[PDB]
Amino acid sequence: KCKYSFKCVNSLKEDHNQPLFGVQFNWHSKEGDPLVFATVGSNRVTLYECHSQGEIRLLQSYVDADADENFYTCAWTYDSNTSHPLLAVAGSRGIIRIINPITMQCIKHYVGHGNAINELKFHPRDPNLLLSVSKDHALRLWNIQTDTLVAIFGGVEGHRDEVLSADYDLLGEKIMSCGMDHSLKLWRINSKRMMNAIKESYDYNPNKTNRPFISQKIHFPDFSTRDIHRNYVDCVRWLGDLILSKSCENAIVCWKPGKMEDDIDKIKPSESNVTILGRFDYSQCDIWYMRFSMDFWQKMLALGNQVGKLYVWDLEVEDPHKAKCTTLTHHKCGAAIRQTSFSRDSSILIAVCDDASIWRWDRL
Amino acid sequence: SMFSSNRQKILERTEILNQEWKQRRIQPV
Numbered sequence A: 001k002c003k004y005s006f007k008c009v010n011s012l013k014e015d016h017n018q019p020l021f022g023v024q025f026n027w028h029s030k031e032g033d034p035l036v037f038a039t040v041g042s043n044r045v046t047l048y049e050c051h052s053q054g055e056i057r058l059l060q061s062y063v064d065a066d067a068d069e070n071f072y073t074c075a076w077t078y079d080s081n082t083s084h085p086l087l088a089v090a091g092s093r094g095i096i097r098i099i100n101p102i103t104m105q106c107i108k109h110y111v112g113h114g115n116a117i118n119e120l121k122f123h124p125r126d127p128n129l130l131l132s133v134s135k136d137h138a139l140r141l142w143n144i145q146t147d148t149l150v151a152i153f154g155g156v157e158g159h160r161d162e163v164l165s166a167d168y169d170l171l172g173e174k175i176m177s178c179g180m181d182h183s184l185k186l187w188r189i190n191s192k193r194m195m196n197a198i199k200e201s202y203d204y205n206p207n208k209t210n211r212p213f214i215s216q217k218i219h220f221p222d223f224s225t226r227d228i229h230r231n232y233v234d235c236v237r238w239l240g241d242l243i244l245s246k247s248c249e250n251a252i253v254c255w256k257p258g259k260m261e262d263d264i265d266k267i268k269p270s271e272s273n274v275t276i277l278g279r280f281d282y283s284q285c286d287i288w289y290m291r292f293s294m295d296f297w298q299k300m301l302a303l304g305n306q307v308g309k310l311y312v313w314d315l316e317v318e319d320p321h322k323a324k325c326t327t328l329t330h331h332k333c334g335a336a337i338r339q340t341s342f343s344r345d346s347s348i349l350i351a352v353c354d355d356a357s358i359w360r361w362d363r364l
Numbered sequence B: 001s002m003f004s005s006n007r008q009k010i011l012e013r014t015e016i017l018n019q020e021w022k023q024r025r026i027q028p029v
C-alpha cells in the first residue's frame, strides 16, 4: 500500500504561452540552499526558487538569440573547478548551450548533431560528461571541460530512427537509449575502450597540439531489443539493474535483458531474450513526448497525462497495481503534463504543461 | 526476492551518490 500524499499549493503561467517541455530541479544544490528548478519551452529557459506557503519565486529568464529555437530538454551540472552551477539546454536547432544560471549568459555551445536534440543527461559521477540524444539517430558523449566529443553511439547497429531518450545507470557504468525504431539499446561506458576514450578527452590540450581530437565511433551496442513495446519508445530510465520504459500503450514497462536470473554485467551483446517483470498502468497518455520521472532515492515514480492528471507510484511496493498513490488532480490543470521533477529531498513535485503552466505539489 | 535484491542495489548505489553530494559545496543560484 502507498502512503504518499500531496497537495497543490500553487500554479503559474509563463508569459510566452508556449508549451513547456522540460523541468528539472537542481539536485546539486547543497542541503540548506533554496530549491531551484529550471523550465524550458519555446526559445525560453526560466529559473525559479521554491519558498514557503507554496511561493514560486521567478529568478531569471534566458531568451535565446534565435527566435526559431524550440528547447526540448535541460540538465544541471557544476563546474568541477569553481563548484559554480551550470545548466545545459538544447532542442530543435540540435545545438547544446551551457548557460551560467546566475548571469543567464550562454558560456559555450556544441554543434555537431545533424538534427534536433531530445534529451540531455549529465553523468552521475563526473559533472563534465554530457550525453545528448538526437533525431539524427545517434547519441553523443561530450567532455565539457576539454570541449571534446568523446564518442558517437550510432552507425551499423545503432538506432535506425530518431532517439527519444536515454539514461545513465546509478553508478554511470552504462546507458540505455530508446527511440522511434521501437528499440532499447544498451551502451556500456565502463568498457576498456570507453574508459580510455574518456581518459584521452581529458589529456587533450589544444595549446599543446594542432591535431583535432578524435572521437570514438561506437557502432555496436552491448544489448538490443525491440521485444518490449510495439511502437516508439519515448522514455527510458534505469531502476537499479532493471529498466522502466514507455510507449503509447498507457503502461510503463518494467523489464530486464536476458532471462530472469541473468546478471546485467554478464549479458552478451548477442542476447536475444528479455524478461518483463511488471507494468505501471495509467490512462490518457497515448500521445508522443511524455516523460516519466523518479525522485533521488527512487522510492517514487511520477508521470503526467494528456489531460493534466499526475500519476504517482510508490516503488517500495512490489506489486505495481498496489503501488499506485492517489492521482494528483486539480480542476484548473487540464493541459498535457509533459514532464515533472521532484526536489532532491522529494518534498516538492513540479509539473509543467502545454498551456505554459507550472504546478507545484507539496508532499504532506 | 528479485525485488528485495534490486532495492538493496538502489539503496547501496544512491548511498554512494549521496555521500559524494554531501562532500561538495555547490554555489547558490
Ligand SMILES: COc1ccccc1CNc1ccc(-c2ccc(CN(C)C)cc2)c2nncn12
Binding pocket: A019, A021, A022, A072, A073, A116, A117, A118, A119, A164, A165, A234, A235, A288, A289, A290, A291, A338, A339, A354
Ligand atoms: C517532453 O519532452 C520529451 C519527451 C520524450 C522524449 C523527448 C522529449 C523532448 N523532445 C520533444 C518534446 C516535445 C515535442 C513536441 C510535442 C508536441 C508538439 C505540438 N504542440 C502543439 C503541443 C510540438 C513538439 C518534440 N518534438 N520533437 C521533439 N520534441
